[PDB]
Symmetry: C2
Subunit: 246 residues, 2 copies
């Protein structure tokens, strides 16, 4: 019992005009009954996107901080995210980790607080190129996942996203088999360290390169439960990725 | 001749209902013609704040990034800020620098991009208790101001904010004479290093502790042209600070 999950990470892209247009497209898309869809707009447009999107698509913040209110110029809290109608937050995204230096310690604390506040969390992990080539893929993503698990009580509110950071802009790419390998090792970590129950019911989505051309082969991997989509999430092509199991 | 400037930095505080109430109070108060008022809401509420606020009050983003669009989950661009109807961005705020580790070099790149896109910039500088008790206040704030200056081609759209980070949350308080000392030295830096034109026209606002009772005296200091208000900007007290010259 794992419902197919497709998250669209718009990253720092779009304006009210172009996003309005894209939202119109998605509002007309037939989202399958077996599929849960979430879009993560730029923080300035969480409000806008929730107002314009049809309820069949949930809204995620791309990040948040770890307290409800405070002297943290530039941050938003899970309270504000809910106040705008979003029900998810993306935490630990590769860009937060490796461009903006967000530690594991910090990400775990955001997870605890987002969960305590009633949000769903799309919790991202994954290994860089140096790490993969040293043999420490397992170590790196287990450690990352351990830190997230320490701050989760209710796993029904969590989706794990594997980001093959080693394959992003590096000269390397991941095969569907390489994706499947990491996802079944992560499910083995959940079964081992949490419960078979949690393992069987927790979506592990793929956060590497995915397009309309590649989504069916990726979605048919037994341990790949969906996608955290980058570039293609800004295009009608997102609808094709949503239809991946159909 | 230099226009009195009050920036209200709401930091990570408020929800649509509470901010709606404060916005009501501000809309209702009369801003003196000789003063320029700007409010910086949490980033989730830039759009909301702009729509609720009277045109007499300007809206600022609390931070932004240094390209127009890109793969930066969690960030917003000056284009987005403008798209939301905001005309200012706060950059280099002590929380960005010291809680979130934003480098001077990063902050310079933001100033450059923000200015290029047509946004006003409230650029923040200041020394820690570390650096003041080491007698290197001048070195720190001038070096900070230099990096900013290197990424400004139009000073008409820049306000400098001195934040006495040494005297906020530390147990130490700053006197108006200590405020004036740094502000005078900053203006003299601009004279030496940019132009008399810039030195004489550039607002240097005070970002240390401002209350309804401390504001008149701070305001009368000749090189203190306004304030970047913390806690008091969330209260009707902001009105008193806006009226500090009256």
């Amino acid at each position: 019992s794992r419902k197919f999950f497709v998250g669209g990470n718009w990253k720092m892209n779009g304006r009210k005009q172009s996003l309005g247009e894209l939202i119109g497209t998605l509002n007309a898309a037939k989202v399958p009954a077996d599929t849960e869809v979430v879009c993560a707009p730029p923080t300035a447009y969480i409000d806008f996107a929730r107002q314009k999107l049809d309820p069949k698509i949930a809204v995620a913040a791309q990040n948040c901080y770890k307290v409800t209110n405070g002297a943290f110029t530039g941050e938003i809290s899970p309270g504000m995210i809910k106040d705008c109608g979003a029900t998810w937050v993306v935490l630990g995204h590769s860009e937060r980790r490796h461009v903006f230096g967000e530690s594991d310690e910090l990400i775990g604390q955001k997870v605890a607080h987002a969960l305590a506040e009633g949000l769903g969390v799309i919790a991202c992990i994954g290994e860089k190129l140096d790490e993969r080539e040293a043999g420490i893929t397992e170590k790196v993503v287990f450690e990352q996942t351990k830190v997230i698990a320490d701050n989760v009580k209710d796993w029904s509110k969590v989706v794990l996203a594997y980001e093959p950071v080693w394959a992003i802009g590096t000269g390397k790419t991941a095969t569907p088999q390489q994706a499947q390998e990491v996802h079944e090792k992560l499910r083995g970590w959940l079964k081992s360290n949490v419960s078979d129950a949690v393992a069987q019911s927790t979506r592990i989505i793929y956060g590497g390169s995915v397009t309309g051309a590649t989504c069916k082969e990726l979605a048919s991997q037994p341990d790949v439960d969906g996608f955290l989509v980058g570039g293609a999430s800004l295009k009608p092509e997102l609808v094709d990725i949503i239809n991946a199991k159909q």
